[PDB]
Coordinates of C-alpha atoms and ligand atoms in Angstrom, one line a residue:
X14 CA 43.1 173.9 131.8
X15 CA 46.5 172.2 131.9
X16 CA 45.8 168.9 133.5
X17 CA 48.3 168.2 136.4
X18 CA 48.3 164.3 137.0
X19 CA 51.8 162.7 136.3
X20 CA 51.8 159.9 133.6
X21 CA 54.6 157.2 134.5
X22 CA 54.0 155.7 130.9
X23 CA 55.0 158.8 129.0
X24 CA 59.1 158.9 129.3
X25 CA 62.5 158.8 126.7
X26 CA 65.0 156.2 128.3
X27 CA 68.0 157.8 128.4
X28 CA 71.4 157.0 129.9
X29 CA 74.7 158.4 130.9
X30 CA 78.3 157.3 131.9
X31 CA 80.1 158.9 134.8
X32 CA 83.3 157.2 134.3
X33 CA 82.6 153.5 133.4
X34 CA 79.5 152.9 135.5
X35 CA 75.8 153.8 132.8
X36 CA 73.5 155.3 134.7
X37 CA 70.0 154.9 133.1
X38 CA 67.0 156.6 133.9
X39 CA 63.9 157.5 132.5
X40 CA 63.0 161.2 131.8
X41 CA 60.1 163.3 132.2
X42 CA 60.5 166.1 130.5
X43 CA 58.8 169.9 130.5
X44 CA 56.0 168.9 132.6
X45 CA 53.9 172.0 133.0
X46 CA 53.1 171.6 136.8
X47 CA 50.7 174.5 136.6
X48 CA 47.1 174.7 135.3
X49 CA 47.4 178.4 134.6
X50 CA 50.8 179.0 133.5
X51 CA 52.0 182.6 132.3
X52 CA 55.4 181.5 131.0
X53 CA 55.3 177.4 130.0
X54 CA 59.2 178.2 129.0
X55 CA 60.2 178.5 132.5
X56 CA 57.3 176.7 134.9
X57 CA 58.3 173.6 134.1
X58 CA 59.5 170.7 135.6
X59 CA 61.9 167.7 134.6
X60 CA 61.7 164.6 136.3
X61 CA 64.3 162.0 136.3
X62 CA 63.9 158.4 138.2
X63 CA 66.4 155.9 138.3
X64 CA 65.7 152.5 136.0
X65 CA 66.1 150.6 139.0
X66 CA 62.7 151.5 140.2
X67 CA 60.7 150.4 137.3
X68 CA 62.2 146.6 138.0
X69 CA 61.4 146.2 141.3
X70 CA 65.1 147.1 142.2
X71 CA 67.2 148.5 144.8
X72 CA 69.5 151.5 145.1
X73 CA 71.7 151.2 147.8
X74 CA 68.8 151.7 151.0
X75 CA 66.5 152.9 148.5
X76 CA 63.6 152.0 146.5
X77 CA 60.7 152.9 144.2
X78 CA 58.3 153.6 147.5
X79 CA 61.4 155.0 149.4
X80 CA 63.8 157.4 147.4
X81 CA 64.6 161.2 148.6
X82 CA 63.4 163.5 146.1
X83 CA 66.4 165.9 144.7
X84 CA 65.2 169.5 144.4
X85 CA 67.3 171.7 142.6
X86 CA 67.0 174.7 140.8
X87 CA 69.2 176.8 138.8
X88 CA 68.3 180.2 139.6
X89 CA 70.9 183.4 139.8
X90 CA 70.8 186.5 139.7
X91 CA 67.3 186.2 140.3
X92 CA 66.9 186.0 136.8
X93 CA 64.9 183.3 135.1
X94 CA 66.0 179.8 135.6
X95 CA 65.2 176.6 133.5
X96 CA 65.0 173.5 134.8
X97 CA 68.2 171.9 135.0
X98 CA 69.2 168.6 133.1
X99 CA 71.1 165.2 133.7
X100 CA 74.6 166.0 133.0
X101 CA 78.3 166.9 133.5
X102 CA 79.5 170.3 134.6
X103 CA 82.0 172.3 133.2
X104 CA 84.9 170.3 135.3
X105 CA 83.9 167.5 133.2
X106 CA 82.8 165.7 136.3
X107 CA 78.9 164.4 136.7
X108 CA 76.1 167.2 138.0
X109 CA 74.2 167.2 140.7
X110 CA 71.5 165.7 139.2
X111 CA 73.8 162.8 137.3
X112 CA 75.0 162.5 141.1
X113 CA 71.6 162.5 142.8
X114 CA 70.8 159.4 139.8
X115 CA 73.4 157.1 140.8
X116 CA 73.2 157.5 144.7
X117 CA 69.1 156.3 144.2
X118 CA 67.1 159.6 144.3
X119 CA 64.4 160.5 141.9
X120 CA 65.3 163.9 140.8
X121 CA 62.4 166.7 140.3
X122 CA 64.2 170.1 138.9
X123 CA 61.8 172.9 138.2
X124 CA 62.6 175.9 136.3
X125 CA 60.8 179.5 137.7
X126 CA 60.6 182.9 136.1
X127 CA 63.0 185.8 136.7
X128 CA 63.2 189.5 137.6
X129 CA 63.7 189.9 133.3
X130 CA 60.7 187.9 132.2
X131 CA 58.0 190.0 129.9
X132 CA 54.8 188.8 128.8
X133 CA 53.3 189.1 125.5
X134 CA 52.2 193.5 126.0
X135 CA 55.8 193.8 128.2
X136 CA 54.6 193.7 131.3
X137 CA 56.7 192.4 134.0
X138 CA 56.0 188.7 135.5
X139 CA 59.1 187.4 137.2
X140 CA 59.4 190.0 139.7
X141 CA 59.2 189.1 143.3
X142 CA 57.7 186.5 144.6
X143 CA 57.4 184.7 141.5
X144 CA 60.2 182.4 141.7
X145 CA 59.3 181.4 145.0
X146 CA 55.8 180.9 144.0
X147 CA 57.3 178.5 141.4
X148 CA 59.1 176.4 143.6
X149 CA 56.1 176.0 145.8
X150 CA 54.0 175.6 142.8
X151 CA 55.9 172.4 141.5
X152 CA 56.5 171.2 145.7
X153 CA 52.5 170.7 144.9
X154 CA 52.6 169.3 142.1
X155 CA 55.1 166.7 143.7
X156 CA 52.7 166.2 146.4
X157 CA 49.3 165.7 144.2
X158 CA 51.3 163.4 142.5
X159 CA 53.4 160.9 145.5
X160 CA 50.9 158.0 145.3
X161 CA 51.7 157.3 141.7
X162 CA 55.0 158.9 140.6
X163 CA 58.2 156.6 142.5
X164 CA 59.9 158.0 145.4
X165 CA 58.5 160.0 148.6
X166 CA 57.1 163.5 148.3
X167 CA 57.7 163.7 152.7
X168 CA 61.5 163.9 151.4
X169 CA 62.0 166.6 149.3
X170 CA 65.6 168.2 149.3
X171 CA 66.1 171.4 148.0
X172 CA 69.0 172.6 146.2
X173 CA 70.1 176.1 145.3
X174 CA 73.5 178.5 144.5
X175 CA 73.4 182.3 145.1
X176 CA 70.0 183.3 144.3
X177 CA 68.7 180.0 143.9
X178 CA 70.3 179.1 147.2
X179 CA 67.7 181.5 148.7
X180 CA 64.6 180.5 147.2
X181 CA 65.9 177.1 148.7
X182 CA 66.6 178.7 152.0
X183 CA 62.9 180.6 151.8
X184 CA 61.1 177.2 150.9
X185 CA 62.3 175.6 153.7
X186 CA 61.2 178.6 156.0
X187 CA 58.3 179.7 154.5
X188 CA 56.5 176.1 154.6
X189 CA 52.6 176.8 154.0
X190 CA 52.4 180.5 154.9
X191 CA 49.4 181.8 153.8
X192 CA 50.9 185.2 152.0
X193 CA 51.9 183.1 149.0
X194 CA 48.5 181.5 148.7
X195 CA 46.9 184.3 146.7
X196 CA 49.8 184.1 144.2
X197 CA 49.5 180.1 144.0
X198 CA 45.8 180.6 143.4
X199 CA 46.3 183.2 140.5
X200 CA 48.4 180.4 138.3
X201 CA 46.3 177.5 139.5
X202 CA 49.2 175.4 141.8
X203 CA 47.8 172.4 143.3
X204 CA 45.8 172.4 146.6
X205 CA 48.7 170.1 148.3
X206 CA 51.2 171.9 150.1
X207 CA 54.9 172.8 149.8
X208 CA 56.7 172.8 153.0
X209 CA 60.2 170.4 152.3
X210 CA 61.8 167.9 154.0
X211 CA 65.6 169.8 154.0
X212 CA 67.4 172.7 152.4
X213 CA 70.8 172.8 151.0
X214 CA 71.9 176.4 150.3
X215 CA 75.4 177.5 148.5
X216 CA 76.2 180.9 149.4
X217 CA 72.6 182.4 149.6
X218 CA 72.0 186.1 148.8
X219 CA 69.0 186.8 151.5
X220 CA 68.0 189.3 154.0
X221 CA 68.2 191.8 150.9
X222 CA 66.9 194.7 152.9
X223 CA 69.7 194.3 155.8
X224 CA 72.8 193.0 153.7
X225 CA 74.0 196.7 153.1
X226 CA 74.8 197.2 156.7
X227 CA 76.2 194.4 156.9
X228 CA 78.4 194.4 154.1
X229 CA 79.8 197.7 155.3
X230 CA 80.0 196.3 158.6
X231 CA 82.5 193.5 157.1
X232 CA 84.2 195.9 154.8
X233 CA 84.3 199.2 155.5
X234 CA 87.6 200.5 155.1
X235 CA 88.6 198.7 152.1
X236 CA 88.5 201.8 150.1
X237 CA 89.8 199.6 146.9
X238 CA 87.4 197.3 145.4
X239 CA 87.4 194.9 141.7
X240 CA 84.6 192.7 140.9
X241 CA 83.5 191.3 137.5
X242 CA 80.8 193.6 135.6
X243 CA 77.5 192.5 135.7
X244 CA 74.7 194.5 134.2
X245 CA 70.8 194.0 134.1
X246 CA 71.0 191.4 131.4
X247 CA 73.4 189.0 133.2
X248 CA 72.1 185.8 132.9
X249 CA 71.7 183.3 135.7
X250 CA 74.5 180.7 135.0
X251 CA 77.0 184.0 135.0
X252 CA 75.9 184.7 138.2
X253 CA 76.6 181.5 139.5
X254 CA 79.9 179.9 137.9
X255 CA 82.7 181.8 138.5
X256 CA 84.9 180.1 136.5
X257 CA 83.8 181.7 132.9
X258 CA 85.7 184.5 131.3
X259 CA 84.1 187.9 132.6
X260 CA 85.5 191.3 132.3
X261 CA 86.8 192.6 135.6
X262 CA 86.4 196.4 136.6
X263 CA 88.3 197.7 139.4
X264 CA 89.0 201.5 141.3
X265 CA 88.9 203.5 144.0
X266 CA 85.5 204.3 146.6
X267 CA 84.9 207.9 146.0
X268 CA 84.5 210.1 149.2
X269 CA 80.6 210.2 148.4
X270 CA 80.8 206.3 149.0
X271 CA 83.1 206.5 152.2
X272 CA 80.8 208.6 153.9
X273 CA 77.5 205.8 153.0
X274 CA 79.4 202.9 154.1
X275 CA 80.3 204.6 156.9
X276 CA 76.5 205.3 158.4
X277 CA 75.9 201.9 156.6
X278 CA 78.1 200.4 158.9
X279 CA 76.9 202.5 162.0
X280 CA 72.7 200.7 161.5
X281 CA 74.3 197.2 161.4
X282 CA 74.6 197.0 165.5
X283 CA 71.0 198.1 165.8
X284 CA 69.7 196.0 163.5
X285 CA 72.1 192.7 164.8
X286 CA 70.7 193.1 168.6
X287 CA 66.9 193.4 167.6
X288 CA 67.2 189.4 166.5
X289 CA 68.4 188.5 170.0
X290 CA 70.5 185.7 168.6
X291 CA 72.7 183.6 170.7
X292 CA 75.4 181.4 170.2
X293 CA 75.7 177.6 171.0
X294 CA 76.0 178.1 175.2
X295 CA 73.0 180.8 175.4
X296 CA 75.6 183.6 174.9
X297 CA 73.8 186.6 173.5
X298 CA 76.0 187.7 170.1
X299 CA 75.6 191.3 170.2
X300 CA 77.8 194.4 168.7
X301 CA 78.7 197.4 170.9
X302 CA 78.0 201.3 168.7
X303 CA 81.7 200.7 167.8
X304 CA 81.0 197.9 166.0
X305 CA 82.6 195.3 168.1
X306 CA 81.3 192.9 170.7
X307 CA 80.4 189.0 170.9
X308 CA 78.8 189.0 167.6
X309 CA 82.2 189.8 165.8
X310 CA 83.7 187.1 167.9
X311 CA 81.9 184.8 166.5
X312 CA 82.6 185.2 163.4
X313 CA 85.8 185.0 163.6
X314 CA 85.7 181.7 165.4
X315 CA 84.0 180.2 161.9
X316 CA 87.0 181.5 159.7
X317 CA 89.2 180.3 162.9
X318 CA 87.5 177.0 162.3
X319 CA 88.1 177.3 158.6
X320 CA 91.7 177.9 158.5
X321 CA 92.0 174.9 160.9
X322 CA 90.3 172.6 158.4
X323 CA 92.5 174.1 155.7
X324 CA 95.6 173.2 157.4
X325 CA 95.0 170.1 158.6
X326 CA 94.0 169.4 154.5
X327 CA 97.3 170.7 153.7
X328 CA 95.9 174.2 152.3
X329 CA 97.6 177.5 151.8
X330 CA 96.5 179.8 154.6
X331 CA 99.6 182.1 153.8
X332 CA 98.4 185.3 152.2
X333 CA 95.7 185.5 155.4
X334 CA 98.2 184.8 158.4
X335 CA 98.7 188.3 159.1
X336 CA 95.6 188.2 160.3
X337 CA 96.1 184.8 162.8
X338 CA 97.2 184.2 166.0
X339 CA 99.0 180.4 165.0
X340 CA 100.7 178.4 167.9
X341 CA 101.4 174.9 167.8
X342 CA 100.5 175.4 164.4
X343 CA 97.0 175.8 165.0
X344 CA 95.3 178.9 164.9
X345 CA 94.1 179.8 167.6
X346 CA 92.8 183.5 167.4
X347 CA 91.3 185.4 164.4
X348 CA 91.6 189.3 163.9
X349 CA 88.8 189.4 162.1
X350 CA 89.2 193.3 161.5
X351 CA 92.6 192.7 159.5
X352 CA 90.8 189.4 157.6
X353 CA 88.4 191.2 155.8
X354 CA 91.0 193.9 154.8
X355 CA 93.3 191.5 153.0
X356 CA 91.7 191.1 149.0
X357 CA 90.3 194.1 147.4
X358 CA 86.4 194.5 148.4
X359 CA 84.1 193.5 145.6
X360 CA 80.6 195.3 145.4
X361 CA 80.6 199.3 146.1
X362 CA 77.9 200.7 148.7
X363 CA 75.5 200.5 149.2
X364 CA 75.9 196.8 148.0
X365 CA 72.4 195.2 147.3
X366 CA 70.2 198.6 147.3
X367 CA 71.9 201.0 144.9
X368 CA 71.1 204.7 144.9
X369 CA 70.2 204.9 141.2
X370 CA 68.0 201.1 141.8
X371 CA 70.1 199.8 139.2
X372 CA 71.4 196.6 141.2
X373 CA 70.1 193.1 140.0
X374 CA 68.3 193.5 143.6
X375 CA 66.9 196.6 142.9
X376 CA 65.2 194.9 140.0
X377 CA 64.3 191.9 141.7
X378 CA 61.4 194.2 143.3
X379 CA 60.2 195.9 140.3
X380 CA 56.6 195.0 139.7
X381 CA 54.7 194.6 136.6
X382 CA 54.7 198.2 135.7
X383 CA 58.0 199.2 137.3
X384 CA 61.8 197.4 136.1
X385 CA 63.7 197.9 139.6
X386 CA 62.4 199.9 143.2
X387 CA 64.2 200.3 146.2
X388 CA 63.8 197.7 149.4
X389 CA 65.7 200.0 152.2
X390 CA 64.7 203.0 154.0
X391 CA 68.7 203.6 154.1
X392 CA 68.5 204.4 150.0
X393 CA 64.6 205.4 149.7
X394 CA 65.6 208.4 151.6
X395 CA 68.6 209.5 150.6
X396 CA 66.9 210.0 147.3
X397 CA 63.5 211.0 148.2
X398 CA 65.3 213.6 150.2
X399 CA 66.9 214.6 146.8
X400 CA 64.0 214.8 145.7
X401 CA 62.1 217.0 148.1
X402 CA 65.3 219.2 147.7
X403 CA 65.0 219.5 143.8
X404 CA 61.4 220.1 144.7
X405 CA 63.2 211.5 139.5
X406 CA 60.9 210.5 142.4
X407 CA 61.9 207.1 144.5
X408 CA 59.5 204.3 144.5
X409 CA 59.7 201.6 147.5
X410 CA 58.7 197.8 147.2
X411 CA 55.5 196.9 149.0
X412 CA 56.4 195.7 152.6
X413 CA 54.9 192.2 152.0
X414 CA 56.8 191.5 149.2
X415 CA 60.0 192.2 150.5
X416 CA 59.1 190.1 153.7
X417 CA 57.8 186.9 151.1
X418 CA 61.1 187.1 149.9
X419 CA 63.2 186.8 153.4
X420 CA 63.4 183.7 155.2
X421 CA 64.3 185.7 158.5
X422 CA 60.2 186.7 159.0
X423 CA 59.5 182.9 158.5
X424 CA 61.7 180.6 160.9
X425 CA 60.3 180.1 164.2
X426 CA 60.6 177.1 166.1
X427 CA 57.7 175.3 164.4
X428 CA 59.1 175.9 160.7
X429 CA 58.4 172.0 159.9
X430 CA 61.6 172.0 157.5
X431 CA 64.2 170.1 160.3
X432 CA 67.7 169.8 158.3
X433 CA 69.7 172.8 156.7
X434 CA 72.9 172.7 155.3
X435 CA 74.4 176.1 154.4
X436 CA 77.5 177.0 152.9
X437 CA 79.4 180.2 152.6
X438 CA 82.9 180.5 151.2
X439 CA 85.9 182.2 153.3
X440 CA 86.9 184.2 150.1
X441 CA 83.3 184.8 149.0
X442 CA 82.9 188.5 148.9
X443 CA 79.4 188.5 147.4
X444 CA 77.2 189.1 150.1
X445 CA 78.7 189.6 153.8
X446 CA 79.4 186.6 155.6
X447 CA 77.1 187.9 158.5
X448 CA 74.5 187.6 156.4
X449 CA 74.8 183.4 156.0
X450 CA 75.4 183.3 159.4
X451 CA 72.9 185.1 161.1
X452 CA 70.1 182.2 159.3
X453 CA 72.5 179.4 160.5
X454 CA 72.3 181.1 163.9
X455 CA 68.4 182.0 163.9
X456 CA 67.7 178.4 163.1
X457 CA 69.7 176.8 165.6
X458 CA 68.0 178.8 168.0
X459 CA 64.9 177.7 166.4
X460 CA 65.5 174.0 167.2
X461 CA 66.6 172.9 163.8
X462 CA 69.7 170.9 162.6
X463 CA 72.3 173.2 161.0
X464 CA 75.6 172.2 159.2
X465 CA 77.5 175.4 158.3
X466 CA 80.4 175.5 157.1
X467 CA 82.9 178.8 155.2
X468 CA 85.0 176.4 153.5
X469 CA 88.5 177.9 152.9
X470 CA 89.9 179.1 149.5
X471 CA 86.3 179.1 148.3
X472 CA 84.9 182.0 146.3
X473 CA 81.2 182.5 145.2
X474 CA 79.8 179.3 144.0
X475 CA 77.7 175.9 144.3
X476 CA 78.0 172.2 144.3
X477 CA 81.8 171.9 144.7
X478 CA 81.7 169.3 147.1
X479 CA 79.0 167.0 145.8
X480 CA 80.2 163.7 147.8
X481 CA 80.5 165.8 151.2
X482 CA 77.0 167.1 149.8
X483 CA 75.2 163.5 149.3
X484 CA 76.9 162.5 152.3
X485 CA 74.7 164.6 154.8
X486 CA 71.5 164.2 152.6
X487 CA 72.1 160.0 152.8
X488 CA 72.6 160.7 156.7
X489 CA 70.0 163.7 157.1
X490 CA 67.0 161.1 155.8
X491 CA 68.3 158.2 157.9
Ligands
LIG1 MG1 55.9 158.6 145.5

């Protein structure tokens, strides 16, 4: 009943200064971009376009026919995000969409429901694969509309942190697969499509079901964690800026949580050799039932490759170098072993799928009737075994749902999505760094362009480096 045809004539002009230059745009606010919506609050889309393009002017190479469409969303925690707004962040400095304004692109920012979102009789409707559905769903409606809203709908760049830096990652794998069809239908998305032209993704948390291993993998051993607390009701800007005041809770692994992270880290080889991935000269990256091998290597040639950058920036790579082989002041070889031993460990195992299913994770798959499930055999059976003991009874996600919700099932060589840029910080303790690297490494192998990067210094976080960022979009769209 919501009609979905975008009107160019109804828009606020608005402006904003950056430090001297005014940008002015015109802004299309709250734009339902579904005919059936179950939550108008959060599917919705804003819409910015330069004022340029209403004067038969020029940005830069770009016009009103020719402008990259900037895609972000502001999703963490998987927990309800609105649609973001032309702004500054909390540095001060312009946003990503302020940025995206005054390099030439039109800027299209839906918001999506969340893993916390009731309707009217409490019945859950942001559990997975909602928020991906509402990506795709306003992807559509960006597509029904190209021939009359400026800018082209063929380059759509997506933009995510955390979270959101997933659902990016999953909407440039997932391009047109049918199992989100049924979904789309339900709310009444377009009939378009919603595969994207590039992803951008800040420190995704994906491969839910295999980041436990792997985060053992990387950390067991480090018997000493601190984190800041978040509980079920953290919302998603916590989850993604690190730099506001949390409380911190810190202690010891009890010997309950030794012995899980240890046959946590013991599934992570057999899992790592099923993919068959390989490294840039056909070299197979596998991992020995010790836990060593190529694989390992590998990753410590990207925090290798890290500290170099850091040092030839003039960074501190001091409290690490313990864990560095350093020549002609270059480093040359990486323990990574004694690297991932150095800060205190941040989440407790298992990491993503809890044992109570009280993890934001956990609740992520929840369905309408249910607030969290599990995702892992590894968890489902410690419990049901508890269970069947006892003679509380687990419940497990539904299979296709937790495959709609990992880009892994997706890439292939004929994903259509060509350019990916993925960054995981060198400090960033919130998922495993495996984890980041193992899609960088699937989609190289899938013929697609890859710039990955673990900056150093960097903790969990998003859009620190805009001008590196707008930098490879300008060069990724030619
Ligand atoms: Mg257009």
């Amino acid at each position: 009943d919501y009609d979905l045809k975008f009107n160019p004539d109804k828009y606020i002009s608005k402006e904003i200064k950056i430090n001297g230059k005014k940008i002015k745009y015109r802004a299309y606010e709250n734009i339902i971009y579904i005919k059936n919506p179950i939550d108008k609050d959060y599917q919705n889309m804003n819409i910015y376009i330069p004022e340029e393009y209403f004067n038969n002017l020029s940005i830069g190479s770009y016009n009103s026919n020719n402008a990259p469409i900037f895609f972000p969303n502001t999703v963490g925690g998987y927990m309800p995000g609105k649609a973001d707004t032309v702004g500054l962040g909390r540095d001060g400095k312009a946003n990503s969409l302020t940025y995206a304004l005054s390099k030439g692109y039109v800027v299209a920012a839906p918001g999506a429901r969340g893993r916390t979102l009731t309707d009217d009789k409490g019945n859950y409707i942001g559990k997975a694969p909602a928020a991906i559905v509402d990506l795709k769903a306003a992807v559509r409606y960006l597509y029904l509309n190209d021939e009359v809203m400026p800018g082209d709908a063929n380059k759509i760049i997506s933009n995510g942190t955390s979270a959101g830096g997933a659902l990016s990652a999953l909407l440039g794998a997932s391009g047109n697969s049918q199992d989100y069809l049924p979904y789309l239908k339900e709310i009444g998305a377009a009939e378009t499509r919603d595969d994207i032209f590039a992803v951008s993704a800040y420190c995704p948390i994906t491969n839910l079901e295999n980041a436990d291993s792997a985060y053992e993998w990387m950390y067991n051993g480090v018997n000493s964690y601190s984190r800041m607390e978040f509980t079920r009701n953290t919302s998603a800007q916590e989850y993604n800026d690190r730099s506001l005041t949390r409380s911190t809770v810190q202690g010891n692994l009890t010997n309950d949580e030794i012995n899980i992270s240890n046959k946590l880290k013991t599934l992570f080889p057999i899992y790592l050799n099923s993919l068959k991935l390989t490294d840039d000269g056909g070299n197979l990256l596998t991992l020995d039932k010790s836990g060593n091998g190529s694989f390992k290597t590998y990753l410590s040639i990207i925090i290798r490759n890290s500290a170099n950058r850091a040092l030839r920036e003039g960074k501190d790579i001091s409290q690490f170098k313990k864990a560095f082989t350093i020549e002609n002041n270059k480093v040359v070889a990486v323990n990574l072993d004694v690297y991932t031993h150095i800060g205190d460990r941040m989440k407790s195992p298992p990491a993503f799928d809890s044992l109570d299913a009280s993890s934001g994770e956990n609740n992520l798959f929840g369905d309408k009737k249910s607030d969290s499930k599990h995702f892992t055999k590894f968890s489902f059976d410690i419990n049901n075994k508890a269970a069947i003991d006892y003679f509380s009874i687990p419940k497990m996600a539904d299979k296709n749902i937790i495959k709609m919700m990992n880009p892994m099932y997706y890439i292939d060589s004929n994903t259509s999505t060509k350019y990916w840029r993925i960054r995981h910080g060198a400090i960033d303790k919130d998922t495993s760094l495996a984890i980041p690297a193992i899609l960088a490494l699937k989609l190289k192998n899938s013929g697609k362009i890859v710039n990955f990067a673990a900056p150093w210094g960097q903790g969990h976080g998003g859009d620190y480096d805009l001008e590196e960022l707008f930098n490879w979009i300008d060069n990724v769209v030619k």
